[PDB]
Amino acid sequence: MDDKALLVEVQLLESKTYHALSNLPKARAALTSARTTANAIYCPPKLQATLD
Amino acid sequence: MSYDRAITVFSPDGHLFQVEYAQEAVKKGSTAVGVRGRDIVVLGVEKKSVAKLQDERTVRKICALDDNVCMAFAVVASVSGLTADARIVINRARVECQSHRLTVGDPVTVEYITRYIASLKQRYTQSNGRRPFGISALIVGFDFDGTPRLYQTDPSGTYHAWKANAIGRGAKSVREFLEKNYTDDAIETDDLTIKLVIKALLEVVQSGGKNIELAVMRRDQPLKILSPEEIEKYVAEIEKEKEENE
Amino acid sequence: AEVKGVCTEAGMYALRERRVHVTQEDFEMAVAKVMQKDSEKNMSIKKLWK
Amino acid sequence: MSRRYDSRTTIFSPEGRLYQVEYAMEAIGHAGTCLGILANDGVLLAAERRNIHKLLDEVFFSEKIYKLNEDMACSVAGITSDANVLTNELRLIAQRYLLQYQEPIPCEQLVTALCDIKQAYTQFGGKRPFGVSLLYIGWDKHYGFQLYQSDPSGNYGGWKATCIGNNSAAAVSMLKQDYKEGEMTLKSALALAVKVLNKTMDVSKLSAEKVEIATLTRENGKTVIRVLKQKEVEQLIKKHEEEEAKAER
Amino acid sequence: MSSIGTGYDLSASTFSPDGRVFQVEYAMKAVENSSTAIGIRCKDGVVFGVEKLVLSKLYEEGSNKRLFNVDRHVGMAVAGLLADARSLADIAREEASNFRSNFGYNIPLKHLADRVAMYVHAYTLYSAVRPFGCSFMLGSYSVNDGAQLYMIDPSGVSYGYWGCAIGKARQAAKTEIEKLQMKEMTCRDVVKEVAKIIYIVHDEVKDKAFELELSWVGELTKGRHEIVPKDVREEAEKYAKESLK
Amino acid sequence: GSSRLEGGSGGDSEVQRTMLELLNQLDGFEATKNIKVIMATNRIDILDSAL
Amino acid sequence: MAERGYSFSLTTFSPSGKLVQIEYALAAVAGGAPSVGIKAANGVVLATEKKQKSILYDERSVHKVEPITKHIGLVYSGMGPDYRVLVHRARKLAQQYYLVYQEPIPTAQLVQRVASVMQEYTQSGGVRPFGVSLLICGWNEGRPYLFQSDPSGAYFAWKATAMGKNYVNGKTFLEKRYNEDLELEDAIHTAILTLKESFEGQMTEDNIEVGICNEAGFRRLTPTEVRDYLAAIA
Amino acid sequence: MSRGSSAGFDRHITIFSPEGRLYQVEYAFKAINQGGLTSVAVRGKDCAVIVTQKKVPDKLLDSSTVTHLFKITENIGCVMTGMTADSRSQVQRARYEAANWKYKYGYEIPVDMLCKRIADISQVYTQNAEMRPLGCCMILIGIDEEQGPQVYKCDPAGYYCGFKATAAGVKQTESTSFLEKKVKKKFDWTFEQTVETAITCLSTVLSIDFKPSEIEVGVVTVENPKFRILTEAEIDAHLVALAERD
Amino acid sequence: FEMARTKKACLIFFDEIDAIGGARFDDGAGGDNEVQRTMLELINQLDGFDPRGNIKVLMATNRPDTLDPALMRPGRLDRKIEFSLPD
């Protein structure tokens, strides 16, 4: 399922964690991945605000 | 019923439209020839459009109304077989033949069937929201007498007896060649009558024994529809006779 | 038209990220954005352009 | 009022055709491949299954393979709508004949009863003709194995091999080219039918979701009517598919 | 519109975006063409006054009459086309006759009026037939239901009136009723009034010439619908003539 | 022009059918042709008898 | 009370070879309320929008979601009056069957019966076809069943289907959200989501009706139960 | 073509348009507006109420037998809005069916059974191209046994549905939206309260401002088994309270 | 019509009006407007407040079914004669 807000949320949380470890390629890759699934117009305004 | 919308309404030309539309559809094609013999009457249609992959045994374009009455039909278009249209006339005529034989102990004559065709076309005319069939039928059969007869009907419902007639693709052209072939010997010898039907069919377009189907009736005995294998042998023998006279 | 729409959508992303070269990341977001247009074309059973 | 609205499509044309039957004739052609081939131990029908999704219930045996009797089966080319009323009526007629005669009904006897009804609509009444043309397959005692085709006014023709639907000219010519009047057995007969369906149809490898093939086979003196299942169909697809592969070389 | 070959006046199943039905309306314009028939409810009966159209010079009484007896105690005055009126007389008389047979009491006008109206209304709905080209009044006296006046138009409405007019002059004629107190008033005095209204309203181009026919159904006739005596007609005629001068 | 199409098999097909007729026989330029008339359509319904 | 009826040709084939009336009837159902049917294989669930756009409608006994008989129900989309006669007619066939067999009519059998009616309306003149698409549900003879019958008189078999506005998107959302070999609970959840993907926005429990079908029977739940479900879905 | 299907048949007879729904059917809803009658019905827990014009136009028209509140039968009564010709016709058909039901079936008739039965009939009329979709709309009151007092309205289109509040007539849309504000700012329905709500909606919308002889109110009460018109006495007592309301 | 009246003896033979003479209606796309226009003009000068001048009129129609009630009454159609299929 990528046609959902919920998938965006996991990917964002993960990108924050790899960043802290200083697993920098991982955090970067995960951050683009969250934005790709965020594009869906099934996501409500708030989810978009947190994503920025 | 609820449908009473006009399909036929009378013309100042002194005709019924459908009947005339039907009559030209037998001018333009589906050669059906019949000759009357002296023991046996034979009718033949050319085209079942056997393209060498179709079945020949079960296809009927000559249908036995009775065991002493048979008809061969024609009317064509782009919708080439109007077998459906025929199939109604065939089923109602079949019961009526049998019915006439239950009531009246004489075997039903072709003259009864011909009046019955004239009334079916007409009845469809008078009834609201209804239209005449396009068929023309060559009604063959045997009377009380046991005399062979060939009668021909038109899409209006007018009938005449005729010794030999051809209809389709120039009714008059096929009949005037065939007119020479109708001689006293030809009508007497039964075998020569079978050839006369086939010999006419060949004038319009030549060859094919599968395209040609003909059914034979002898006395009051049941209809026998001939194998195509019997036809092929017969067209080959007809073609040589043409070279002999000429 | 849709296929070209991938490159075209990519450019919007490169400005946003503030790149000078259209990176791989720009393309990831673009396929998904173009897939949503396709989905709309199909829903409507008519073309998008009018 | 009423006649004016009536487009006079029930009128005869001078040429000797009915406008409606001709317009119905086109409705059959839009629609999918239905072909029947004669074989010498059984007879087979191959019809295009047009119900492909990954969420399908399959509440019916098939939506195009109809078993009309317990000795006849048929396939469809035309419109599903007409096919549903018609298919039911075909069942009462097949079944009543079975009661009286107690022998399998001729394929020819089966097209004719319906024909009256088809003709009735076209000529008068201003009623549409049925949008399907049916290929009936059967075995009856009298002729042995037979295939019959009906058209939108009930015009009938006995055929060894015939095809109606989408790319009807292509399917019938091709089948005419390899096979002419009953040169093959039941085994080979399924492999040609799927092959024809393959070329005609947009998917050029097929699956069992794309094709549905039905057999009617005379075993131990009694007619068995079976819709073959997806499993049996894949075997038949691999046999034709492989035969095509050799052709190229 | 009026010149057309599909729908409008061919049909009546048709609706305009306004909602109108033109055929039912054309039937209404048809009732308008001939002279007026008035029928006035009293608390004791109904009195009719009808113009009876003189269409020739070789007349006899009752010729082209518009006074019918639906039931013994119901009279029916028609206005508009007489062709349609004869068929309507048969249907109304028939519904009443069977009623008397079964129920065994004098047909309530409220019931009879509902049944004929339904019949007119079945035709206005239909595009399969045209609707009647006349409008009629049924008027009656009984002591089992009281004095009742009903009116049925080409549309298929039944509502009770206490004084009604149908025909050409009806908008003028109706006004003269508001002047009169007729709800409470003997049927003897009301005959004098229906006669004077008709004489003044008539003019030589609504119809050439008429014969005055008045009818009783009240305390005087004892609840019988009968035609008025020679005496009654003439005094009511006289009062009409004297008021006309 | 979707209205032209379902109306009687296209007003746009009308223009195509005529141009196709003109192009079938014209002057001495029937022999050589380097001017074609091309149609884009997506239906088979619109197609009249010459097409 | 004098008529013969009219039967006329606008119900015969056009030159295109397709029937003029059927296309228009399919347009009537597209304009309708969206309706999803999902066969769980643990029961059949049917969901529709309760609303008619004014919510001054009493609907505590008037529903869009009606049982035909003990465990077969119809949910519709499209035209309200035409559906009303089809509901009434469908019941009458069910009870006729009920007299003879003792079991209530199968969804497979019932559709053919209904289909004849749809057919008369197309093929004869002076009538017009019904513009209602039907989702027919049942659980009988050991398997739950979902059928579709469109307005022309075709019946199609689906295991998840969507209708009305954005019938196309519903079929794709069903393909995506719902997978095979999931349970009944999962089915109920997915239908309300298909209705979200098929007209979007605000929902109350008087804007939705949900009915569940088992061999226990078809029942349309009370307003409260439907309310709890709403909160689950996004 | 624009401005109706005049080169087409779609407003001439009943058949689906190129746009989906018929012109004719939509047009039937426009015939209601012609009647001049507007009805407002309000559902309570004491009675279900109808308020309609008693209004007479002359001395010559009765008011002792002219009413648009009709007693279909004792428990259930109705109001007709629109065309008067169609209005009577449905009332009689309804009355006969109500007696027949009670006689054969033996079940007492709720609001639903009359409403649904008429609605299915008015579907047949819409469906036939001989008959026309009705010129009137029927708003029924009557006591449902499970629910309580119920107000239903059936469409000339052939649809029935339940209503807590409804309006039909010339100002169909204006009155229903007005009454919507009254539902939203809810009233615990007493006897006097349902009657009051119905009259204020109609008085504001028409902008005549009614008095008690000009309206006639119809109740079917939980202690009245019969249908009764409240007439002027009760209406005036409410009427003054309406001026004091807001 | 004016030109006809001024000259000495005119016969205006209005040739073959089948649908070019048709009864007044409007479709809201163009309507019968243009057709009725000629028709109506001929009515206004003929009857008018001035009568028909020195103008004789002959009408050829195959359809009187189409024509307006104004044309069919006399003052330009005094006698109707059917020249149809012969005896």
**In this structure, what are the phi and psi dihedrals at residue E126, rounded to the nearest 5 degrees?**
-80, 150
Give the H/E segment covering residue A27: helix A24-38
Q: Is H56 within 8 Å of H161 (Cβ atoms)? A: no
DSSP SS3 for G50: coil
CA distance D53 to chain B (A): 37
Contacts of D29 (CB under 8 A, 6+ apart): D164, D165, D166, D168, G17
The radius of gyration of chain E from alpha carbons, rounded to an integer in Å, stands at: 18
Q: Does A41 touch chain G (CB under 8 A)?
A: no
- Give whole-number Cα distances, G119 to B188, D117, E231, G151, G194, in Å: 59, 15, 71, 9, 30
Q: Is E147 within 8 Å of E159 (Cβ atoms)? A: no
Q: Do the domain assignments include residue D26?
A: yes
Interhelix angle for G223-232 vs G184-196, to 10°?
Answer: 80
* Residue recorded with tokens 């006079």: D8
Q: Which amino acid is at B173?
A: S
CB neighbours of residue F21 within 10 Å:
12
- Taking alpha carbons only, the member of E1, E9, E49, E12 closest to residue E212 is E49
Closest by Cβ to A40, choosing from C25, C31, C36: C36
Q: Is B100 within 8 Å of B141 (Cβ atoms)? A: no
> What's the CA gap between D1 and E49, in Å, rounded?
41
* Residue recorded with tokens 């009984």: E142
Residue D37 structure tokens? 């081939």
- Taking alpha carbons only, the member of G76, G78, G59 closest to residue G68 is G76
Helix count (H) and strand count (E) of chain G?
A: 6, 10
- What is the 3 state secondary structure string of E59-91? CCCCCCCCEEEEECCEEEEEEECHHHHHHHHHH
Q: How far is CA G153 from the centre of its chain?
A: 14
Q: Is E42 within 8 Å of H39 (Cβ atoms)? A: no
Closest by Cβ to G123, choosing from D29, D54, D127: D127
Interhelix angle for A24-38 vs C24-44, to 10°?
Answer: 20
Chain D residues with CB-CB distance to B24 below 8 A: 14-16
Contacts of A23 (CB under 8 A, 6+ apart): none
**Are E14 and H60 a contacting pair at CB < 8 A?**
no
**In this structure, what are the phi and psi dihedrals at residue I20, rounded to the nearest 5 degrees?**
-105, 10
CATH topology of domain E7-245: Glutamine Phosphoribosylpyrophosphate, subunit 1, domain 1 (3.60.20)
Q: Does B18 touch chain D (CB under 8 A)?
A: yes
Q: Where are the alpha helices (DSSP H) in I1-87?
A: 2-6, 33-47, 69-72
> What's the CA gap between D225 and D166, in Å, rounded?
26
**Are C42 and G166 a contacting pair at CB < 8 A?**
no
> What's the CA gap between E216 and E141, in Å, rounded?
10
- Taking alpha carbons only, the member of H105, G144, G155 closest to residue D84 is G155
**Are E14 and H4 a contacting pair at CB < 8 A?**
no
Contacts of H145 (CB under 8 A, 6+ apart): H108, H110
Interhelix angle for D107-123 vs D80-101, to 10°?
Answer: 130
**Do D and I count as touching (3 or more CB pairs closer than 8 A)?**
no
The radius of gyration of chain D from alpha carbons, rounded to an integer in Å, stands at: 19
Interhelix angle for E82-103 vs E109-125, to 10°?
Answer: 130
Task: State the residue range of the domain holding H215.
Answer: 2-245
Q: How many domains does chain D have?
A: 1
> What's the CA gap between I36 and H84, in Å, rounded?
38
Is domain G4-232 classified as CATH 3.60.20.10?
Answer: yes
The radius of gyration of chain F from alpha carbons, rounded to an integer in Å, stands at: 13
DSSP E170: H
Q: Is B239 within 8 Å of B208 (Cβ atoms)? A: no
Residue H162 pairs in a beta bridge with: H152
Q: Where are the alpha helices (DSSP H) in chain E?
A: 22-32, 82-103, 109-125, 170-179, 187-201, 230-244
Q: Is B25 within 8 Å of B32 (Cβ atoms)? A: no
- Taking alpha carbons only, the member of G3, D3, G10 closest to residue B9 is D3
* Residue recorded with tokens 């979902």: G146
Q: Is G148 within 8 Å of G123 (Cβ atoms)? A: no
**Are H13 and E125 a contacting pair at CB < 8 A?**
no
- Taking alpha carbons only, the member of B80, B7, G22, B135 closest to residue D126 is B7
Chain H residues with CB-CB distance to E122 below 8 A: 89
Q: Do the domain assignments include residue D119?
A: yes
CA distance H122 to chain G (A): 9
Report strand pairing: I55-59 vs I10-14: parallel
CA distance G126 to chain H (A): 5
Nearest CA in chain G to H15: G128
> What's the CA gap between B150 and B162, in Å, rounded?
6
> What's the CA gap between D110 and D91, in Å, rounded?
10
> What's the CA gap between F41 and E226, in Å, rounded?
81
Q: How many CB pairs under 8 A join D and H?
A: 5
| Burial grade of H214 (CB within 10 A; 0-12, 13-18, 19 or more) | middle
The radius of gyration of chain C from alpha carbons, rounded to an integer in Å, stands at: 12
Q: Is H171 within 8 Å of H206 (Cβ atoms)? A: yes
Q: Where are the alpha helices (DSSP H) in B104-164?
A: 110-126
| Burial grade of I13 (CB within 10 A; 0-12, 13-18, 19 or more) | exposed
Contacts of B120 (CB under 8 A, 6+ apart): B89, B92, B133, B157
Domain ranges of chain B: 2-239
> What's the CA gap between G1 and G117, in Å, rounded?
25
Domain ranges of chain E: 7-245
Q: Is I57 within 8 Å of I10 (Cβ atoms)? A: no
Nearest CA in chain G to H151: G58
* Residue recorded with tokens 């309000």: H42
User: For the domain with range B2-239, which CATH number is right: 3.60.20.10, 3.40.50.10790, 3.40.50.720, 3.40.50.970?
Assistant: 3.60.20.10
- Give whole-number Cα distances, G70 to E184, G45, G214, in Å: 65, 15, 10
The angle subtended at Cα B40 by Cα B36 and Cα B43, nearest 5°, is 55
- What is the 3 state secondary structure string of chain D? CHHHHCCCCCCECCCCCEHHHHHHHHHHHHCCCEEEEECCCEEEEEEECCCCCCCCCCCCCCCCCECCCCCEEEEEECCHHHHHHHHHHHHHHHHHHHHHHCCCCCHHHHHHHHHHHHHHHHHCCCCCCCCCEEEEEEEECCCEEEEEEECCCCCEEEECEEEECCCHHHHHHHHHHHCCCCCCCHHHHHHHHHHHHHHHCCCCCCCCCCEEEEEEEEECCEEEEEECCHHHHHHHHHHHHHHHHHHHC
The angle subtended at Cα D194 by Cα D191 and Cα D198, nearest 5°, is 130
CB neighbours of residue E121 within 10 Å:
28
Best probe of the H interface among E1, E4, E13, E115, by most H CBs < 10 A, is E13
DSSP H109: P
**Do G and H count as touching (3 or more CB pairs closer than 8 A)?**
yes
The angle subtended at Cα I48 by Cα I45 and Cα I54, nearest 5°, is 55
- Taking alpha carbons only, the member of B87, B58, B73, B65 closest to residue B167 is B73
Sheet holding D156-158, edge to edge: D72-77, D133-140, D144-150, D156-158
What is the torsional sign of CA G100, G106, G112, G117?
positive
Q: Is G89 within 8 Å of G96 (Cβ atoms)? A: no
* Residue recorded with tokens 């006698």: I79
Q: Identify the CATH number of the domain in which residue H95 sits.
A: 3.60.20.10
CB neighbours of residue D9 within 10 Å:
18
DSSP SS3 for G138: strand
- Composition of chain E by helix, strand, coil, percent to 5: 35, 25, 40
- Taking alpha carbons only, the member of E26, E210, E226, E19 closest to residue E134 is E26
Q: Is B25 within 8 Å of D14 (Cβ atoms)? A: yes
Residue E190 pairs in a beta bridge with: none
**Are H157 and G84 a contacting pair at CB < 8 A?**
no
> What's the CA gap between E38 and G215, in Å, rounded?
71
Q: Do the domain assignments include residue D25?
A: yes
Contacts of D152 (CB under 8 A, 6+ apart): D20, D21, D24, D25, D27, D28, D118, D122, D129, D130, D131, D133
Cα distance from N-terminal residue to C-terminal residue, chain C: 14
- Give whole-number Cα distances, E59 to D91, E55, E56, E65, in Å: 73, 8, 6, 11
Domain ranges of chain G: 4-232
Contacts of B144 (CB under 8 A, 6+ apart): B106, B107, B109
Contacts of D130 (CB under 8 A, 6+ apart): D24, D78, D82, D83, D86, D118, D121, D152
Contacts of B204 (CB under 8 A, 6+ apart): B31, B46, B168, B169, B170, B174
Q: Where are the alpha helices (DSSP H) in H50-190?
A: 84-104, 111-127, 172-184
What is the torsional sign of CA D192, D193, D199, D203?
negative
Q: Is G212 within 8 Å of G192 (Cβ atoms)? A: no
Contacts of B99 (CB under 8 A, 6+ apart): none
> What's the CA gap between D161 and B52, in Å, rounded?
10
Q: Is B48 within 8 Å of B59 (Cβ atoms)? A: yes
> What's the CA gap between D227 and D233, in Å, rounded?
10
Residue D86 structure tokens? 């018609």
- Give whole-number Cα distances, B70 to B63, B65, G217, in Å: 6, 5, 62
DSSP I75: S
> What's the CA gap between D246 and D235, in Å, rounded?
17
**Are A39 and C36 a contacting pair at CB < 8 A?**
yes
> What's the CA gap between G206 and F20, in Å, rounded?
61
Residue G110 structure tokens? 């019932």
Report strand pairing: D72-77 vs D42-48: unpaired
> What's the CA gap between B218 and H165, in Å, rounded?
87
DSSP SS3 for H218: strand
DSSP H20: B
Q: Is D5 within 8 Å of G10 (Cβ atoms)? A: yes
- Give whole-number Cα distances, I12 to B55, D94, I15, I20, in Å: 71, 74, 9, 16
Closest by Cβ to E122, choosing from G1, G4, G5: G1
| Burial grade of H126 (CB within 10 A; 0-12, 13-18, 19 or more) | buried
